Design a protein around this ligand. Structure first.
Ligand SMILES: C[C@@H]1NC[C@@H](O)[C@H](O)[C@@H]1O
Length: 437
């Protein structure tokens, strides 16, 4: 191996109770809310099709001008209790919130910059109210944090001069100050999800990513820290120069997912995927007709996909300027919530099952060695093929919702045909298998 002072931290999966809760949660929501929600992907009568949270860049607005949006920040319909009820109803077990996105505007009243929720007509600590409200519903809260900060004059994209070095060094101190602040103001935080860490400035300072991770783990017992934060001695990100995962879990699956046949490597480490509802919109964009919008079944497929391969899935929402959610998102959360009420036993606290992928859908494995078949593609043959691993036998199949026995017929060695239900469920459904070893 190449030796490294700032390479991979521990060996494999954490199995302390905090990581087990992070894992067993499985389904979370993402909240991208910032000044970008005001223009909503439109600058001066020109609608941009790019991601709305990147409008400063699309429309080339200077920092000074972009941040004046603060003067319009007055989410009059915001009600954190309602945000939390909505999440509880969706069956989301955790919410990851943009504390500060690339624009640099903070959703908590930071004492280290003026660009925060304090210096707005609304004044209030949005982050704090959300933390309290989600926690009151027994929902964990995670903090998204963009290292790249377009509002701080000391940020640099690359270290070209002594000047740059003096500035960036001060920037990392600034960054540290905000991180300790979030950690000490909101100690129930369970995770820092770092973003905007890909610039050469950060790659050349791998030492600081390890320090960031280490400092937060001391400030917050059991906190989880994502791989995206981390660079090693040689500038390699996520995985270190010897191929070891840095941070507590892998977080590169953004609007994509690992192949359920070819990428089974992911089962060896914790990981978390995040997804948008449209093609590429994280912040609120006012014109969702500009790209394909995923239906509820398409999002549900991706949730179960992730869990079947040992991962979490986080569904993103981009709240409106006014503090409400658009009706597309409300319909999504309600549709997901209804499905999770019926079928969530096959999601919460589940994991990779070790069975070869089949066309009808996905397997998941429960805490007590239950094996769930989650069927998305209904075979006309009316037979669901199950190939067991060597030594596993199938005792029984039960329709989860009704308890009805489902016929299991042996077809060859380590292979069965599990019948479809007598009555078509009319939606993705679960058959729960009792397996013996
Ligand atoms: C989750 C995504 N991470 C990349 C960032 O540039 C996007 O705006 C989103 O925050």
């Amino acid at each position: 191996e190449i030796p490294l002072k700032y390479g991979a931290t521990n060996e494999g999966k954490r199995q302390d109770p905090a990581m087990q809760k992070f894992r067993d949660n499985r389904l979370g929501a993402f909240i991208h809310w910032g000044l970008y929600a005001i223009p909503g992907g439109e600058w001066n009568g020109k609608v941009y099709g790019g991601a709305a949270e990147w409008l400063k860049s699309w429309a080339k607005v200077p920092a000074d001008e972009w941040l004046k949006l603060m003067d319009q920040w007055n989410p009059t319909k915001f009600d954190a209790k309602k945000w939390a009820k909505m999440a509880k109803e969706m069956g989301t077990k955790y919410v990851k919130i943009t504390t500060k996105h690339h624009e640099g505007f903070c959703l908590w009243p930071s004492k280290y910059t003026k660009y925060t929720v304090a210096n707005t007509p609304y004044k209030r600590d949005i982050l704090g109210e959300l933390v309290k409200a989600y926690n009151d519903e027994g929902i964990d809260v995670h903090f998204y944090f963009s290292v790249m900060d377009w509002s701080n004059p000391d940020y640099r994209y690359d270290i070209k001069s002594k000047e740059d070095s003096i500035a960036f060094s001060r920037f990392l101190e600034f960054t540290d100050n905000q991180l300790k602040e979030l950690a000490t103001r909101y100690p129930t935080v369970k995770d820092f999800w770092f973003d905007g860490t890909w610039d050469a400035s950060v790659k050349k300072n791998g030492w600081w990513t390890a320090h960031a991770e280490q400092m937060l783990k001391e400030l917050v017992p059991g906190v989880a820290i994502n791989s995206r934060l981390r660079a090693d001695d040689k500038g390699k990100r996520h995985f270190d120069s010897n191929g070891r995962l840095m941070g507590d879990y892998e977080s590169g699956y953004e609007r994509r997912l690992p192949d359920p046949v070819k990428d089974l490597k992911v089962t060896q480490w914790d990981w978390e995927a995040c997804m948008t509802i449209p093609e590429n919109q994280w912040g609120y964009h006012k014109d969702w007709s500009l790209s394909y919008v995923k239906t509820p079944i398409e999002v549900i497929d991706r949730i179960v996909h992730a869990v079947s391969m040992g991962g979490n899935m986080v569904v993103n929402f981009g709240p409106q300027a006014d503090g409400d959610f658009r009706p597309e998102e409300k319909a999504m959360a309600t549709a997901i919530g209804k499905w999770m009420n019926r079928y969530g036993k096959a999601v919460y606290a589940c994991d990779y099952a070790g069975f070869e992928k089949q066309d009808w859908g996905y397997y998941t494995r429960g805490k007590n060695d239950e094996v769930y078949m989650v069927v998305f593609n209904q075979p006309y043959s009316e037979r669901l093929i199950v190939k067991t691993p060597k030594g596993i036998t199938v005792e029984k199949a039960t329709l989860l919702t009704t308890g009805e026995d489902i016929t299991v017929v042996e077809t060859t060695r380590n292979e069965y045909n599990v019948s479809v239900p007598k009555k078509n469920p009319g939606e993705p459904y679960v058959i729960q298998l009792k397996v013996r070893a």
